[PDB]
Amino acid sequence: EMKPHPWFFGKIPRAKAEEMLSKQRHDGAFLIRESESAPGDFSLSVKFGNDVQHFKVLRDGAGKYFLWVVKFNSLNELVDYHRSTSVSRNQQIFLRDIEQV
C-alpha cells in the first residue's frame, strides 16, 4: 504493498501546477489539485507539449466525479479510467504518473 498516490498535490496554485508539469518530459504527466478559485472542487492539470492543460473535475447530484460524460465513485477511479481513455477531445492524451524528484 500500500502506497499513497503520486498524483495528489492538495492545494497548490494553478500556476505552480504549470511550473511543475512544464518540467515533465512526457505528455499526459498529471496531478490532481484542490482548486483555489473554486474551493471544494478539484482540478486535473496535465502536461501536453509546451502547454499544461487544466480540467474541472465536475460532480453530479450524487457526488460522483467526471470530466466529460463517464462518471465515477472516486477521483481514484476517474484518474485510472483516463490512463487508457483520452482526457482531451482535441488530442489523444492519456494520464501517466509524474516521473518523480
End-to-end CA distance of the chain: 21
Verify binding: residue 92, Na ion, rule CB under 5 A: no
Beta carbon of residue 82, minimum distance to Cl ion (angstroms, whole number): 9
* Subset of 33-62 contacting Cl ion (CB under 5 A): none
Verify binding: residue 88, Cl ion, rule CB under 5 A: no
Verify binding: residue 86, Cl ion, rule CB under 5 A: yes
Which residue type sits at 8? F
From the centroid of its chain, how far is CA 98?
11
Q: Based on C-alpha coordinates, what's the Rg of the chain?
A: 13
Q: Which residues bind Na ion (CB under 5 A)?
A: 68
